[PDB]
């Protein structure tokens, strides 16, 4: 899982 | 799973 | 998947 | 899947 | 998983 | 489980 | 656990 | 082969 | 392949 | 083969 | 695969 | 494949 | 083969 | 695989 | 293969 | 795989 | 084989 | 695998 | 094979 | 694997 | 195995 | 791929 | 790869 | 890749 | 890799 | 890709 | 990919 | 790997 | 990817 | 790995 | 990477 | 390795 | 990886 | 990675 | 990595 | 090779 | 190879 | 070598 | 190899 | 060797 | 090697 | 060795 | 594919 | 794929 | 699919 | 793949 | 893979 | 799929 | 793998 | 897969 | 793996 | 899968 | 793994 | 998989 | 898996 | 897994 | 690249 | 890399 | 690299 | 790295 | 590295 | 490191 | 280190 969330 | 969300 | 989301 | 979506 | 989370 | 989280 | 928590 | 282009 | 470009 | 590219 | 280019 | 250009 | 830039 | 440029 | 990039 | 590049 | 670049 | 580079 | 890099 | 640079 | 540089 | 279908 | 069905 | 199903 | 099922 | 049906 | 079905 | 499944 | 259904 | 289930 | 189901 | 599963 | 199912 | 299950 | 179940 | 053969 | 042998 | 033989 | 035999 | 044998 | 046999 | 013979 | 032959 | 052949 | 023939 | 042959 | 003979 | 030959 | 063969 | 032959 | 073989 | 024949 | 032989 | 042969 | 011949 | 055979 | 080169 | 090179 | 070079 | 080299 | 020099 | 040298 | 050097 890649892409990082805020 | 790629693509940021914010 | 790819595509960022707001 | 391609294709930001706000 | 990678990617950094607030 | 790599990627920083504050 | 890699990834360093503050 | 797959690319697209956005703004 | 795959690339996609964003902004 | 996979890369994308954001901003 | 060549992918796309900006300015 | 030789993608889109801007510019 | 995986490898995204961001930013 | 060639991926994605900027400036 | 596994390798990302964060700013 | 070559990947991605910025300025 | 794994390894990311943080910063 | 070769990855990503930055300026 | 593992290695990471932070900051 | 030959991984990411900075500068 | 290769890992990342900086600088 | 979407395969056959019986019934 | 999406696979046959039966009823 | 997604198998078959029965029923 | 995602399997058969039955029922 | 291959899937074949029979009966 | 390879995927059959019999009976 | 994710295996096949029953009922 | 490898998987077949019998009966 | 995740391997098989029965009901 | 490899799975059957038998009846 | 995460091993099967009964019931 | 390997894991089939009987019965 | 082996396992299998049988009945 | 060897687990097998029977029964 | 497939397809069943008596 | 695929395909039961009677 | 799939495929059962009686 | 898979599959039983009688 | 997988598959059992009566 | 796998496989009860009887 | 592995599985159970009757 | 079925190559070139000579003499 | 099959390759060249010499007299 | 790659196969020349030289002399 | 099936390679060459000579004579 | 299937490897070249000669003679 | 990869082969040449040469002489 | 079958590897190549002389003679 | 790769595989060339030499004189 | 199934080496070479000479004569 | 990487084998060549020299001679 | 099984090795070369020779004669 | 790795295997040449020299002469 | 690694294996030569030489001679 | 290492062996390789010489003369 | 193929093709000899003298 | 192929094709020889006096 | 393939290809022998004198 | 494959190719004998005089 | 494989390939004999001379 | 494979290979003989003379 | 494999391999004989004269």
Same mark, same amino acid.
Do not use: I, L
């Given at each position: /899982? /890649?892409?990082?969330?805020?």
């Amino acid at each position: /899982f /890649f892409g990082p969330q805020y």
